[PDB]
């Protein structure tokens, strides 16, 4: 920060820059940030409110407040996103820039009803980037607070608290606490501003191609294999009796499933099959009973989304995983609604190379075969990785987070976020913001204890965020026309993807990255 | 922006400089910019409003202001627009300099009735000129809210939306929302100012004379052509019967009509004949069922003022055309009023080029004619252009438009704004201002919902403009007095262009550029 | 030409290249080119057969053969035609390269049933490309001939013939004869290759954009105008009588359709109303008889396509301009054809600034009222060019002309193809192309006779064209998405722009290049 109060510390940049292979996004929005807890630490528990087993938690919760720009529309208009995937098969970060700038704090009095807010020009906030990754990271767990999709929305800072290692509601003794006060900080007051520059490390291209080829389909369809099967294990019947014969015949045209193949499907593991008509649903609760979920340390974990797999099969839309899929809120939609308030995510694109999330992956032989024993065979529901497979990742939407961080382990496989998109070992940083205490009027004779009374104050401001995202062109020699995103062209009562008669910002539907084809 | 709160920004300049060939205006005035919408953007259509098949519209509605100078009075005093229309045969713009300063913005609080007013140091305006014409061009429309006539006026920002397309009241799939916070804009504290230059394209001059000449009599009065015309089809009655002969003359003196000329009039598209003079006009209402009207995609727009044409005839002062006239308001009219209150602008000067717009081009000639079958010929209300056509465009007025932006097409024919000006392919970029959001005190819980919660206020200030305009000297030979612009002289109650008793600034009448004369 | 029988004299390139700004698309065909009218010059005429005094021409036929590739679907696959429609506000073309390669030749016997073809080495072509466009021109007149739309499909030459001034089916002593042989020509054997390079004119960008805005409601809807209209001849009836008033409003937002505007429409010539439902058009031959069409010379010309103007109005998609579309046929369809089997484009992206092709460009006064007299209007039902109109020409289309020739006249009028594309003053050269005679073995003994008797022989090789468009960027600050072109999705019995199991390739659908918008 450089000069006083009457001169403003940043400039508005919203932009979207397309140049070559790059695009240059910048967002910038106006936040408010409260007064948490009273500027103190309390640990959280969930001694409180009884829950379950699986429920219990243990950690705590701080005054500081945190940026989140974890989504996709914070950065992309609808129409910038449509050019991006529409035009490319790929796409990922490369550097990151982020600034606050013309900071207000505002205090605010109680009397008798009245409510009176007024500059405070001297009192200060406190901002710093965790470069060090020395905090819980909270990002890419997919909360709110992030910015909104709408440059002219104003948003309030979510709240910063963690969780750690607990027995039942209680704390095991490898617990952590961490004091954010603890940290260097950067001080700001109204003339001040901050800023710092990032650099993403280096990741795989997110895949925004839909395969136009399958895994079982790979082969020539007018030539005929060298490479024999075994088709038959009696003599062809003439209506007679079942004589033992072994007989081979060439993969080729007529039979391609029995045909040789180099390659297996993704992995998965499975999940239970809804149905959007509510007749064609069993009448009881599978929902938490019926689930797909993981057992850990005695709790029972929902896997949700779980292992990118195709959502239904392929004349099927009405199906849909039971947790197998990404679910977004229509405009204006409380924490409990039903079917049709929901916006819900499929994946479509992957049924070349992946599994149907809803079904089994194969069946494989459980016995010896005799002259006496008949051959019985197995379902496999789940299946590790085996050599020779191949997957897609899940998709990202519109509305779906960016990134997540790899947590730091001895060993991963294949590291994505489920949820989707760029796993880092070095995500950005979490940036941390906190309102510093003003003291009210201290007694006049000295008392060691703890103050607890402060002016009630907030601060509100600008903040800004410009990725530059690298890209990956098209290249197909495909005749016909792609798929594309359209919009609707038939008239309607208002538009999308806009404000409507009482200024509420909608997002109509969810938009995936997947339109453009290439061969598998 | 460079200093603080207690330095001025900038100076009051409002200047009048004639130096040459150039005449260098600048005028300021103060401005207060109001808070719109709550800080929404609300898409407004004819839903709500019946009105009718013509009138449906659907469009948006932003909390962005802008500024309009687009009328000559704002850049002229009522004496150097006279100095420019009597010593001058035309003139056009050149730059065009524009500057915001000594930004103030107040913050206001209501209590039981209690108006409280304050300064808000720390709060910003934010402020962006398009330059790449990305924005809907709301100028040139000829709305209220440009600067003032007089300078010591303050004048109130209009709000800025925009139409699109549209089927009835709802919205074609074609439709476009144009978010405004999503371009770069300078934001400013009370220290800041704004500041740009512009530079307009060449454009013809301006027309400021009236011919001396007509197209039919651009002739020699004293000699008699060698060209033939046919005089005659009958033998030269003697009273008895007549007699089948052809017969040809000489262009001459004593028949200038017959006579062969190289030039036709402009083009018209004619418009109903009204009369000041209540009892001379029909009883009916004829206004908009006896309209001149063109009909597009189902809409029946009115054509207004349309193609520029002579509004009355040589000895008629009365009759003026329905649509074909610019119409002025005397100071202290509503927006419904009767003849009185209203000022007329007439085009004279144009009748020896031009039409007149309440009667017909011509007259041609619909049939064969035949021994038998008589000449029949047909009256021609609309035409189009044809070769050899010369014509005059609209005079432009001391309260008129400067310019329109020229759409963006494949074509156009001779582009001038039909309500006068200089027509621009890139006209001076539109300014745009709002009032940043600062938000009030957030509930210290974090809650995802949209605010609609925030501090009351506006923001006030200065504007200044400085356009520069190339003159055109007058040549001419003529050897006796012009006509000129002359003030009242005679004694009356109150001076003509100056402040009454009641402090109201008032403009008599329409002032137009066209009284030196120069040879057709 | 340089070598040998047994060295190919050129590689096949079909190949596009999509770099930055510009566009390269290369396109190589096989051609085959039969002997017309066993070498001679025929002159044809309408004597023939009687026709009717429209119809009438006379005219030459030559032996000579042209090569033809004036649509888009030659240079364009489907999917880069759809790159360039999605992504762009226009394209024009920049440089050609013109290559015959490959030359092959055969003579043919038939003896008793059996023909037999056999390589003739020694025989020769002649080409030429008319560089000084002495020659007439029949490319732009839409025939067929031009290079197929599926580089797999081989396609024969179409035969030069040309048409010149007639009296009735004589010939009027200004008709010319052009003799084709009497011109510079290269002439080549199977070693031989030909090979000529030009350069496109500068011409305006086509519009690939439909605008967002309609001419009409350019205004702002927010603010109310300054410039009063004329809104009653009398005053409010109060239910008794009506009583002379004049009384002005402002234009607002109540209504639109009186409001001011700059600018008017573009210019219509009008044609009939054809619903595409059977039992809503009347029950008649109006086809011809209720045609719209232009008297030359004696001769009824039906005015086709004509005039840009939107097709349908609003709501109604089913009508059509009797003439006024162009009109294509899908797949396996013959010369005479019911309504399923063409295909049927429209300009609906043309409604907000030209007129519906099938109604009224406005209403127009036609008398002087008085007090007795009562206030008439007619309708303009075809209109000339008027200052202050802006207009749209018509699309192109991936099956249309790209350009044409401007005839060589004293002048024009913003010439453009009515068909579409790039009016050019020097347009792409007519290439020639003949296979030379070789005469049948002479008599032996001298006689003065044309022979007459020749070996009858075909010619067949490669011909390959490559345009260099230039592109024009997608600047749009739209916040919403663009409509876009789109494949089918859905499963079908076939794909679209492709072969069907015959081996047919087949066009679905037209593609028109508006789907971009822009602000008008
Ligand atoms: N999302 C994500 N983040 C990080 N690493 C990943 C991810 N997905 C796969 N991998 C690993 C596993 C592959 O062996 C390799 C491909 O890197 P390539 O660059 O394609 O050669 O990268
Ligand atoms: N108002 C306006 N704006 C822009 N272009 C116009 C206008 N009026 C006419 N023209 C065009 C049409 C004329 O052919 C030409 C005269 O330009 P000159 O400079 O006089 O040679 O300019
Ligand atoms: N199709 C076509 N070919 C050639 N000339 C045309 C055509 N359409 C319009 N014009 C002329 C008429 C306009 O005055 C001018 C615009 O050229 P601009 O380049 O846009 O400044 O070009």
Not at 371 to 386: E, F, K, S
Not at 421 to 439: A, C, D, R
Not at 461 to 482: A, C, D, H, M, Y
Request: with cysteine; hydrophobic share 30%; proline share 7%.
């Amino acid at each position: 920060g450089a000069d006083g109060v009457g001169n403003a510390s940043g400039n508005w940049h919203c932009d979207s820059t397309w140049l070559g292979d790059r695009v240059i996004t910048t967002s910038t929005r106006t936040w408010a940030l409260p007064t948490y807890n009273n500027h103190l630490y309390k640990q959280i528990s969930s001694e409180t409110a009884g829950s379950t087993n699986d429920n219990t938690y243990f950690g705590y919760s701080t005054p500081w407040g945190y940026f989140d720009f974890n989504r996709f529309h914070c950065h992309f208009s609808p129409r910038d996103w449509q050019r991006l995937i529409n035009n490319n098969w790929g796409f990922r970060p490369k550097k990151l820039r982020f600034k606050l700038f013309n900071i207000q704090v505002k205090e605010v009095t109680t009397n008798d009803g009245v409510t009176t807010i007024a500059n405070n020009l001297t009192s200060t906030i406190q901002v710093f980037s965790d470069s060090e990754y020395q905090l819980p990271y909270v990002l890419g767990s997919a909360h709110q607070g992030c910015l909104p999709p709408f440059p002219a929305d104003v948003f309030m800072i979510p709240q910063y608290g963690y969780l750690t290692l607990n027995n039942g509601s209680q704390s095991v003794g490898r617990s952590s606490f961490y004091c954010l006060e603890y940290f260097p900080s950067q001080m700001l007051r109204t003339g001040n501003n901050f800023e710092f520059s990032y650099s993403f490390e280096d990741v795989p291209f997110h895949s925004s191609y839909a395969h136009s080829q399958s895994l079982d389909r790979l082969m020539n369809p007018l030539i005929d294999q060298y490479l024999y099967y075994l088709a038959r294990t009696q003599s062809n019947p003439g209506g007679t009796a079942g004589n033992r014969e072994l007989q081979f015949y060439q993969g080729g045209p007529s039979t391609m499933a029995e045909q040789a193949k180099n390659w297996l499907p993704g992995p998965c593991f499975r999940q239970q099959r809804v149905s959007k008509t509510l007749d064609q649903n069993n009448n009881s609760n599978f929902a938490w009973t019926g689930a797909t979920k993981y057992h850990l340390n005695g709790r029972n974990s929902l896997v949700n989304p779980g292992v990118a797999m195709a959502t239904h099969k392929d004349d099927e839309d009405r199906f849909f995983p039971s947790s197998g899929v990404l679910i977004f809120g229509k405009t204006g939609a409380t924490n409990k609604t039903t079917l049709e308030n929901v916006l819900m995510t499929n994946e479509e694109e992957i049924r070349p190379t992946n599994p149907v999330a809803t079904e089994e992956y194969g069946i494989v032989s459980s016995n010896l075969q005799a002259a006496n024993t008949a051959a019985q065979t197995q379902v496999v529901n789940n299946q590790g990785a085996l050599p020779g497979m191949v997957w897609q990742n899940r998709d990202v939407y519109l509305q779906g987070p960016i990134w997540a961080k790899i947590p730091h382990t001895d060993g991963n496989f294949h590291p994505s976020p489920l949820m989707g998109g760029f796993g880092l070992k070095h995500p950005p940083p979490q940036i941390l913001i906190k309102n510093t205490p003003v003291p009210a009027n201290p007694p006049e004779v000295f008392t060691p204890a703890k103050f607890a009374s402060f002016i009630t104050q907030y601060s509100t401001g600008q903040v800004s965020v410009e990725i530059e995202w690298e890209l990956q062109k098209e290249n197909s020699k495909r005749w016909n026309p792609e798929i594309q995103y359209t919009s609707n062209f038939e008239k309607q009562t208002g538009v999308d993807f806009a404000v409507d008669s009482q200024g509420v910002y909608s997002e109509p539907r969810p938009i995936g990255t997947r339109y453009l084809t290439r061969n598998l």
